Give the backbone structure.
Amino acid sequence: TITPSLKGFFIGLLSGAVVLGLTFAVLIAISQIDKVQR
Amino acid sequence: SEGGRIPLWIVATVAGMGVIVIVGLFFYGAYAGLGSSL
Amino acid sequence: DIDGIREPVSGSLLYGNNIITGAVVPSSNAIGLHFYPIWEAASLDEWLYNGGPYQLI
Amino acid sequence: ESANYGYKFGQEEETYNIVAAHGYFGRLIFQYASFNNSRSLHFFLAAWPVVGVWFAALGISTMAFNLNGFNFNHSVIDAKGNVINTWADIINRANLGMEVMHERNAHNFPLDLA
Amino acid sequence: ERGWFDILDDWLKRDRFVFVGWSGILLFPCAYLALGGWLTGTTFVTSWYTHGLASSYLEGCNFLTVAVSTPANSMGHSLLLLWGPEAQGDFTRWCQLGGLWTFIALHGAFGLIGFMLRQFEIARLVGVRPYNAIAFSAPIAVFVSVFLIYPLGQSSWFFAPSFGVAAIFRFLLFFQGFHNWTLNPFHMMGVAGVLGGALLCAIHGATVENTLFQDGEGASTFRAFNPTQAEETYSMVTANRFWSQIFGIAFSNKRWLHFFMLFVPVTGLWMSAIGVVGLALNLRSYDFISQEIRAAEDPEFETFYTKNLLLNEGIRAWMAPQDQPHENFVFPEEVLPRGNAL
Amino acid sequence: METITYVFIFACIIALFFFAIFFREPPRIT
Amino acid sequence: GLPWYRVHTVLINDPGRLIAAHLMHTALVAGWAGSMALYELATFDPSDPVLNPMWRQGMFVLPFMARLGVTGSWSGWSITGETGIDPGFWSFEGVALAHIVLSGLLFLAACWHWVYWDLELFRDPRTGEPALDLPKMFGIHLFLAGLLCFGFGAFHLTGLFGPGMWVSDPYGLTGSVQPVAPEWGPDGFNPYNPGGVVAHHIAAGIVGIIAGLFHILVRPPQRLYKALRMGNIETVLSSSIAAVFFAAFVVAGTMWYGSATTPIELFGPTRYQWDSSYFQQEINRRVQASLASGATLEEAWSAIPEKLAFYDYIGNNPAKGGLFRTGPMNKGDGIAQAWKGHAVFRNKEGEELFVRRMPAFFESFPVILTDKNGVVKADIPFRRAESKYSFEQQGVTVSFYGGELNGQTFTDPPTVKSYARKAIFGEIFEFDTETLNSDGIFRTSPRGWFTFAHAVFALLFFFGHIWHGARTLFRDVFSGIDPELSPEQVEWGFYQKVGDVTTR
Amino acid sequence: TTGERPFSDIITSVRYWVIHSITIPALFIAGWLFVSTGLAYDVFGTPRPDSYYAQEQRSIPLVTDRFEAKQQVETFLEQLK
Amino acid sequence: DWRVLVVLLPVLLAAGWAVRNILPYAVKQVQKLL
Amino acid sequence: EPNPNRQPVELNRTSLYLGLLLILVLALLFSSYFFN
Amino acid sequence: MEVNQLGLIATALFVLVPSVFLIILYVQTESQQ
Amino acid sequence: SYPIFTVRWVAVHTLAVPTIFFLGAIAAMQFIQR
Amino acid sequence: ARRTWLGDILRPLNSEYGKVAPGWGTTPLMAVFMGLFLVFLLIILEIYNSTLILDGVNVSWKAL
Ligand code: CLA
Ligand code: CLA
Ligand code: CLA
Ligand code: CLA
Ligand SMILES: C=Cc1c(C)c2cc3nc(c4c5[nH]c(cc6nc(cc1[nH]2)C(C)=C6CC)c(C)c5C(=O)[C@@H]4C(=O)OC)[C@@H](CCC(=O)OC/C=C(\C)CCC[C@H](C)CCC[C@H](C)CCCC(C)C)[C@@H]3C
Ligand SMILES: CCCCCCCCCCCCCCCC(=O)OC[C@H](COP(=O)(O)OC[C@@H](O)CO)OC(=O)CCCCCCCCCCCCCCC
Ligand SMILES: CC1=C(/C=C/C(C)=C/C=C/C(C)=C/C=C/C=C(C)/C=C/C=C(C)/C=C/C2=C(C)CCCC2(C)C)C(C)(C)CCC1
Ligand SMILES: CC1=C(/C=C/C(C)=C/C=C/C(C)=C/C=C/C=C(C)/C=C/C=C(C)/C=C/C2=C(C)CCCC2(C)C)C(C)(C)CCC1
Ligand SMILES: CCCCCCCS[C@@H]1O[C@H](CO)[C@@H](O)[C@H](O)[C@H]1O
Ligand code: OEX
Ligand SMILES: [Ca+2]
Ligand SMILES: [Cl-]
Ligand SMILES: [Cl-]
Ligand SMILES: [Fe+2]
Ligand SMILES: [Mg+2]
């Protein structure tokens, strides 16, 4: 069954994905705007 | 404004004196209130 | 007899010590800060009992 | 071959590139946290351990006159007056165990004054 | 190909005031959280429910006595995730139960990984050999052995070191009383590496500073150096003669000298880490059996080795009830080991 | 035997010092 | 010339002599396993699997033979106590003989591959230079590992064609080798479910077969090939060392905490079973069950198996040893002969008192006796002059139930104090200290030694991964940095992107 | 130099001080009030000086179970009357 | 909880003041990089 | 069949003195524990 | 003293085997040109 | 001629902002009485 | 170099040194599998650790 701690594991997993997701989303956007001149 | 108006030696003196005030307050606290043994 | 209480401590290899436990043992508490050269002892055997070598070293 | 054969005793030219090392170490932290002057870098290497060991020697030398470490035994007290232990009090428990056991036959009176 | 990956690679490796890199994605959040968590906990968080100790500025402790303390022994080796089954997502309970200790220890571990990846990353971009990253393996080995392996060998995180000045002092003293850690030859090698490393640091810096060439006219000799100059700034030949005549031997190879300076402290820290791995299992160098057999049978036999065990026995009996509260040790006065009078 | 072993090892090290000092590789300037 | 720490680099571009060195290493390791088993067999005492099991005797490889189904000697004995068994060829001796013969065969193969190093197979067909296609070698070797993994779980562990593995009850009383069915549900990931071990090898093996076919048929992407230097064999060394210390840490932990693959009848109890009084609780439950069913106190304790009681003794706790206390545990407290029985202490008022047990942390520990509420009622004083809890003052007696002292009661203080000093160690045993000249000082078990060695090695191999990974990624500057390194690339502001000359 | 305005430039400009003569005192005062209102105690679960012990009790409220540790602490907190 | 707005009001009154003095310069910095 | 990968090995005198010193000191350190 | 008797040969081989290794390497370096 | 909001700006303020807040909290603690 | 019967049979298995797939190839598929494997290790670690507790999974010797 879905124990309270299995629920906690899912909440932990989705939290990390969100944190990593927003981090790379911000980084990719910023890198697309402030490009190096070659 | 004009990035260089206030002389740096004044800046350093005022910042220095503020450090002294805040660290003195901490040593005062060692002799009064919590953690004073009294 | 480091602490001056007639309780001698063994420091040397021949008297049961290894490299880790061995020592030259400090001079006796009965001597305090008195100067204890060989010639202030009545014998070498006295000097050794009282930790004379520590001072010399 | 060992890279040590790339230096010859007494050669006039330096054997490494201090601009490269500064360029690396400057980026590891930030540029102004790194030495570019070999003379002041090596002075720092001398001064830090020497000054520190001077203070250690002065510690033993001043505790020789029984000016001891900070004592915070029972410094924290609650509203009623109960002792609230800190890590300093745990250190004190260990010190007591050393105190009462050391030179177990040498003291006749309750205080170890030297 | 100039896809999003290469564009991002460009931005991460810009030459800015603080270099970032790919390694910075791991390094900066984990280093920042580890530090912030230590500052947060030493300022605001108690150790009452895990240790019976006050441990924060808010409670009246000072810089020497604040700590972030280990969790209670009943937590075992629990990761103590905030959303885990112990705290159940409650931030306040999580603090009271010791959650900040795993938080700091784990983010710290990954921060150190991030720092070493940064040394590799910057070295590859600048074009230097990665010996600085290799030397940093020793602090990582110490952190990992002392803060992770050691408690994992023991009953719980409780017995890991707590993150505080006086808390660490208690750890040193615990290791003398229970492990006889001064007797351990792996610690002895670590001491030699640390003290010999300090020795090398002082003596190399003093030698360079006192064999300088006069490359300028000022009494302050620092000004007479240019980073791009080709010549050595001090005389290896004179340095070599002085030390040969003072001490018998001297360095003659400057590359060997500086490798040796890498080698000595690094190797010593690695040796001490191996000893602590042993102590994780109570695999101590506690006794010399031959000394004990003689001393048991001969009450006149006494060495500094037997003297120190009496000290360890005092430490154990006098600190254990307070230091291990979950054990509920009640030692009546009459059982406490004590010498005469004291 | 332990005592003999300890003193033997110590004596070798002292002999090592002698050779390391007086029969070292001579440093040569080039 | 080559410095001494580099002599083995002559094999980097010589695949035939690399195989010879690998063959010779494999012969040495196989030889060690054969000679270790022979030495163990010449010293092992099979006569008492109850109080003198293999883990009391310093046996290291014997448990690993027993774990996978080798339990008997050609001489007719078995580790579970049976006599008159015929183990077939695959006795402990037959296993050791096969490793010795394998070692000699591999030695001869090594000589052949050393001499005939210049085989056309090791040359690139286009360029004629020595060359190994490591991407495809991985797939081949991964495919073989998959097959072996799968066949081990599917046939050997299941008993479909093979012996199975060592399984036991939760208290390590009735261990034996048994066929094990795989567990396919979530409990298969329980480290204490042996069916999980069977399912892992069936399912990881199949994945390895699939993955192996993939790395055989699909070339590496250019971007990974460049990034990882897949033309450089030292990149395989670096990643292989990384996998190897990962695995060493895992086997060290599962040996310390216990699992289905580290049974206590082969390696001894864990430290945590003493921390939590795991065995003492089962002992007391069985004694309570007996008393509940009308048995007397002497019948309740006489029914406890000696083997169960022996686990409830700190001398079998692996956390009680010392780094330089060498040899079998029998060299310390002696060879266990009999359970003396359960000591029960009482005071002059007839209250039962309980000795406080020694925690594993403590080399020595005071003798303290409490009532059932934890109130101190007697002890052995240090300072006598203000003692109030002395055995003499409190009238402490000891009575034994079960074991060789069953039914006896002692009342003289010095004998009662002697038994109470033993009681801090848990259940009390009679030991033969003479046969081995035991010194009375505790030693750790094979569980301790295994854990120590593999944790230390795992940590050292971490340094190996760092070193060889550094050498792989920085090969171009191994002998120094470029003499013509311009200041512009290392000073700030010249290039927009660090290291990139196209951003000036 | 890597493009950013020099620090000596910034901290000697009137505008820097116009902004930071507000923002620095304001953060300081926010930290003060976090303690002075008692909020810091309740965020972090730190005892006040009158909350380490019940009036007569001398035992530590030590957590002794792993999965009921949260209830143990809440129970210990009720027992303060 | 009144204490949360008493502790955050000095923080948010500081972040508001630094915007009135930096907005004519920040608009100029973001438009320049676009 | 002359294998072309062979290289001479060296150990200079200074390295001999350093190696002997390490070995002898390590033995002086560990011998007490070997005897126990 | 009741020391472990294996300590003697353990210490002796600990010194001798690695010292011999270095002596072999050094002497064949000298004998080279 | 110079940008205001950079990575160095962010790094400086993630450390400096909480440091001033914590200093105010610790200053307040010096007047707490048991 | 020396040909042998067994060498001739194994020749095709050591003939593609240096052969690569253009660009990124299957790297994204590899990333997905690595991410799955991380979640897998995380699960078995947390089960062993008693941070993840499942019905009918009793991490104890009492599971025989
Ligand atoms: C950026 C680097 C970084 C890293 C490496 C870590 C690492 C860690 N954090 Mg930290 N943390 C970070 C940044 C980071 N943190 C930041 C920016 C914050 C502020 C928000 C925090 C705030 C924080 C808190 C409050 C806590 C941690 C904790 C932890 C530890 C456990 C985390 C965990 O289990 O996640 C597991 C999650 C993942 C591994 C995500 C991986 C995603 C996979 C690869 C893809 C699949 C996801 C999929 C798309 C979603 C499916 C959902 C579905 C199943 C329902 C671990 C050491 C915990 C701790 O320290 O306990 C003591 C803890 O309580 N962190
Ligand atoms: C489908 C059914 C199935 C079942 C029932 C199992 C069952 C099992 N698997 Mg298997 N597995 C399967 C399929 C299956 N597997 C498949 C298809 C694959 C892909 C090939 C795997 C790949 C795999 C791996 C890689 C591992 C397992 C393991 C296991 C065992 C886990 C219990 C345990 O003891 O963990 C104990 C191990 C862990 C909980 C993992 C810990 C990892 C550590 C924490 C990472 C940290 C490393 C770091 C460097 C350490 C230093 C830190 C320290 C210094 C502080 C269990 C027998 C584990 C095992 O064999 O354990 C003995 C294991 O490591 N499986
Ligand atoms: C995985 C490795 C391993 C493990 C865990 C064991 C475990 C065991 N062995 Mg076995 N053994 C092994 C490999 C191993 N062995 C090998 C490779 C051999 C062939 C030599 C043997 C031959 C052997 C014999 C002949 C015997 C054993 C016995 C035993 C048992 C007692 C162990 C003991 O007292 O050690 C004591 C451990 C130490 C004293 C630790 C040594 C620490 C070293 C010296 C540190 C060196 C540090 C180094 C100098 C640092 C350099 C620093 C520099 C780089 C700066 C124990 C079950 C005994 C037994 O009871 O059999 C029934 C027994 O008689 N073993
Ligand atoms: C799979 C394991 C493995 C393999 C195949 C290699 C292979 C290599 N190593 Mg690497 N290395 C490893 C693991 C490995 N290493 C580990 C775990 C570490 C950390 C300890 C290192 C740290 C390391 C360094 C610092 C260096 C190498 C170097 C080398 C190269 C030259 C080696 C040599 O000539 O030594 C010659 C060695 C001797 C002549 C005597 C060594 C005696 C040892 C120290 C004690 C004896 C131990 C005993 C005999 C065996 C115990 C087995 C053990 C696993 C239980 C060679 C490619 C060198 C290199 O890169 O050259 C360019 C180099 O400088 N390695
Ligand atoms: C206690 C002694 C000690 C400290 C405090 C220390 C500190 C440091 N060492 C560094 C470097 C090094 N140390 C090295 C060799 C050594 N370092 C040694 C011992 C120390 N080294 C020794 C003995 C050696 C000889 C082998 C080398 C070769 C380097 C470097 O190259 C590197 C450097 O740059 O030097 C200038 C820096 C790494 C910065 C970093 O990781 O940021 C990131 C921050 C992170 C990842 C946070 C980690 C969090 C930590 C691990 C846990 C939390 C700690 C709390 C916040 C504070 C607790 C404090 C209480 C205990 C009182 C840092 C200044
Ligand atoms: C001025 C007070 C100095 C007190 C401490 C002494 C510092 C220097 C001694 C180190 C000797 C190491 C071996 C010699 C190494 C050696 O040869 O040094 C040489 C080095 C350079 O020599 P120069 O000839 O160029 O200059 C020295 C004189 O000739 C003056 O020109 O000397 C200095 O730089 C002296 C600096 C004095 C100014 C120091 C100011 C004090 C700062 C203290 C801050 C920390 C306080 C304690 C906090 C915990
Ligand atoms: C934990 C946690 C977290 C985090 C947090 C953070 C990140 C924080 C930070 C914080 C901080 C960041 C803080 C800081 C502080 C600081 C301070 C408090 C300082 C002080 C200082 C001083 C006091 C000084 C002194 C001195 C010195 C040192 C030397 C010189 C002289 C003088 C005296 C000046 C989160 C939320 C994520 C989640 C939950 C948990
Ligand atoms: C030829 C031939 C043969 C024979 C063979 C043989 C007879 C073999 C043997 C083999 C062997 C018999 C081997 C052995 C080996 C061993 C080894 C290889 C060992 C090693 C060791 C080690 C490595 C150790 C180390 C250590 C020490 C010493 C101390 C402590 C620490 C350690 C652990 C590290 C036959 C008829 C079959 C057939 C074919 C032909
Ligand atoms: C000898 C005093 C009379 C009381 C019995 C003492 C506790 S029991 C005694 O203890 C010895 C040490 O473990 C063992 O060697 C021996 O087998 C055992 O009989
Ligand atoms: O002599 Mn050596 O130790 Ca200086 O305290 Mn008093 O005295 Mn004795 O007691 Mn503690
Ligand atoms: Ca009051
Ligand atoms: Cl003393
Ligand atoms: Cl006195
Ligand atoms: Fe230098
Ligand atoms: Mg105060």
